[PDB]
Design an enzyme around this catalytic site. Structure first.
Site, mmCIF file in Angstrom:
data_model
loop_
_atom_site.group_PDB
_atom_site.id
_atom_site.type_symbol
_atom_site.label_atom_id
_atom_site.label_comp_id
_atom_site.label_asym_id
_atom_site.label_seq_id
_atom_site.Cartn_x
_atom_site.Cartn_y
_atom_site.Cartn_z
ATOM 1 N N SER A 226 1.946 3.249 8.903
ATOM 2 C CA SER A 226 1.591 2.421 7.760
ATOM 3 C C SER A 226 2.760 1.523 7.378
ATOM 4 C CB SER A 226 1.187 3.302 6.577
ATOM 5 O OG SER A 226 0.109 4.154 6.918
ATOM 6 N N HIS B 203 0.813 -1.210 0.000
ATOM 7 C CA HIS B 203 0.000 0.000 0.000
ATOM 8 C C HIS B 203 0.849 1.264 0.000
ATOM 9 C CE1 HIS B 203 -2.838 3.086 1.117
ATOM 10 N NE2 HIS B 203 -2.269 3.240 2.299
ATOM 11 N N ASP C 180 -0.341 -7.791 1.731
ATOM 12 C CA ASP C 180 0.197 -6.444 1.597
ATOM 13 C C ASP C 180 1.712 -6.502 1.735
ATOM 14 O OD1 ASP C 180 0.517 -3.748 1.368
ATOM 15 O OD2 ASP C 180 -0.698 -3.206 3.110
#
Ligand SMILES: [Ca+2]
Ligand SMILES: [Ca+2]
Ligand SMILES: [Ca+2]
Ligand SMILES: [Ca+2]
Ligand SMILES: [Ca+2]
Ligand SMILES: [Ca+2]
Length: 579
Positions: free
Chosen positions: A525, A363, A419
């Protein structure tokens, strides 16, 4: 607005404003509150189309229906034209709304309900929770008529009456002995035959299992990959591609040990048994830092026990919730702050899992709704940071990279599972006592730790909440955050949100309380989920921080991507640089 004897009478809202035509000063005595006149003028800007009758104007003001283009909507309708769930306008996920009070403050954008501040012609609309769908007009009843803005056509789930169901049992052994005719990759690119030159050459030089059936062109798993079956393709050497199947939802939990009997009481400390690190990779190809991963030189090698290490014990009375505090310097030698090339902007987090390989969420490189598309010269990494406002040269290093590998199965459409993204360091960092790779546990080690009662250690700088959501009131704190998160078992995890708990994810976080929102939306993140192992005296990474549900709605837990299955995948990259 006339009849000067009515100037002896103080103006009213419902009187002079709706039925008559109140001036701003009349509206002002007619509302007192400044925000009342703000909303009043927003409506009257949108409600000139409904000035009369009084019912038209009132229904246009209230907003619980659709009037005109419907930007005046203020109701509870959170269902689009095609029925996709509405995205909360505070949460930048899935599609980040640049439209708020800053651009069009009049529309008064609500919690999750549809809003049209940017004047879309489709009527009132809401960002769809689907990343493949930015906006969508909602079934908004028209003010004054039994008509919704759009006929209700919800996105019904796939009908099982028109689909041929596979009656094959889900394949065990991770597809080691698969025999089907699937000879194309996950997305349809055909795999070469194992009789071809490159495939034969790769089989000869690799330690591929002979008991694993080596068919002509079908994708197989002779190296014992846990992510699934795979194959090599022609082109750039070393290319690897899976072949997706009916893989079971498999977790490290459901394996029963042949050496751990039924004596689970009074957790026993290791009796002078320091584990010899049986290296899994070759130092020539995987690089340095493998053997001595996950040991803090100034804490464990210096015999200094940190304050919150003892808090990992589940034997605490009810396990009292630990609030992340001002951490000690350098307690996380592998965490890396990924900034954008220019200007200096704290974008993502990454893990320095080795001396030349960096693990980051896919991401951080591509997500269509937020329009992020990265190349090599568009990011920089900083390793060993404690405060972002200072470049403490005394500890940290500023670096650029040279190559990035995107996980082929990166599917952002549904749930951001797998991810995965790998990076190669362009400038190897000189060894130091404040920088150190973290060990990557195996299946048995992770199962033991989940059965050893040791709570995980979650590291983050609080960028997760501001990246995913746009709540105002809590800016970026000036100190690092490290918390002790206990592992949450699967049932409460699945029951917490409607997002499927995929086969490559597990749970972590505190149990929320009534009225007291926890810290489950803290972190960065692409961050790693670190845990401590008293059995090996080292630290392990087990999960990658994915999109957290605690940021969108209250009372949610943390869901993170499995990483202990990456080992066989990891080699697939390093041989691309060891040939
Ligand atoms: Ca008047
Ligand atoms: Ca009057
Ligand atoms: Ca007057
Ligand atoms: Ca008046
Ligand atoms: Ca009057
Ligand atoms: Ca009246």
């Amino acid at each position: 607005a006339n009849t000067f004897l009515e100037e002896v009478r103080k103006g009213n809202l419902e009187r002079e404003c709706v039925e008559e035509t109140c001036s701003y000063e009349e509206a002002f005595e007619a509302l007192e509150s400044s925000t009342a006149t703000d909303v009043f003028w927003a409506k009257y800007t949108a409600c000139e189309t409904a000035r009369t009758p009084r019912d038209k104007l009132a229904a246009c003001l209230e907003g619980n229906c659709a009037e005109g283009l419907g930007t005046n909507y203020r109701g509870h309708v959170n269902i689009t034209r095609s029925g996709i769930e509405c995205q909360l306008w505070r949460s930048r996920y899935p599609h980040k709304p640049e439209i708020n009070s800053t651009t069009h403050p009049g529309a008064d954008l609500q919690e999750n309900f549809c809003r049209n501040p940017d004047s879309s012609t489709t009527g009132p609309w809401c960002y769809t929770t689907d990343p493949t769908v930015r906006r969508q007009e909602c079934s908004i009843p028209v003010c004054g008529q039994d008509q919704v803005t759009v006929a209700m056509t919800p996105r019904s789930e796939g009908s099982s009456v028109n689909l041929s169901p596979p009656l094959e049992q889900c394949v065990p052994d991770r597809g080691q002995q698969y025999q089907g005719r699937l000879a194309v990759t996950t997305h349809g690119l055909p795999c070469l035959a194992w009789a071809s030159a490159q495939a034969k050459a790769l089989s000869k030089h690799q330690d591929f299992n002979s008991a694993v059936q080596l068919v002509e062109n079908f994708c197989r798993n002779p190296d014992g990959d846990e992510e699934g079956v795979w194959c090599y393709v022609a082109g750039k050497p070393g290319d690897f591609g899976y072949c997706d199947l009916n893989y079971c939802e498999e977790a490290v939990e459901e394996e029963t040990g042949d050496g751990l009997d039924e004596d689970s009481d009074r957790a026993i400390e290791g009796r002078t048994a320091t584990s010899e690190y049986q290296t899994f990779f070759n130092p020539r190809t995987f690089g340095s830092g493998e053997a001595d991963c996950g040991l803090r030189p100034l804490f464990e090698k210096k015999s200094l026990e940190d304050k919150t290490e003892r808090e990992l014990l589940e034997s605490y009375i009810d396990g009292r919730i630990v609030e992340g505090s001002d951490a000690e310097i350098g307690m996380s030698p592998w965490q890396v702050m990924l900034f954008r090339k220019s200007p200096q902007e704290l974008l993502c987090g990454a893990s320095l899992i080795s001396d030349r390989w960096v693990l980051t969420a896919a991401h951080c490189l591509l997500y269509p709704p937020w329009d992020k598309n990265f190349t090599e010269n568009d990011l920089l990494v900083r390793i060993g940071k404690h405060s972002r406002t200072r470049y403490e040269r005394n500890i940290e290093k500023i670096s650029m990279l040279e190559k990035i590998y995107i996980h082929p199965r990166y599917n952002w459409r549904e749930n951001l599972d797998r991810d995965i993204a790998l990076m190669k360091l362009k400038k190897p960092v000189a060894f130091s006592d404040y920088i150190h790779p973290v060990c990557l546990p195996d299946r048995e080690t992770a199962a033991s730790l989940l059965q050893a009662g040791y709570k995980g250690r979650v590291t983050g700088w609080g960028n997760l909440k501001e990246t995913w959501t746009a709540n105002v009131g809590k800016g970026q704190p000036s100190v690092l955050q490290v918390v002790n998160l206990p592992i949450v078992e699967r049932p409460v995890c699945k029951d917490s949100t409607r997002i499927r708990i995929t086969d490559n994810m597990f749970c972590a976080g505190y149990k929320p309380d009534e009225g007291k929102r926890g810290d489950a939306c803290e972190g960065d993140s692409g961050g790693p989920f670190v845990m401590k192992s008293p059995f090996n005296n080292r630290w392990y990474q087990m999960g990658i921080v994915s999109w957290g549900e605690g940021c969108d709605r209250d009372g949610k837990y943390g869901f993170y991507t499995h990483v202990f299955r990456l080992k066989k995948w990891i080699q697939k990259v390093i041989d691309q640089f060891g040939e």
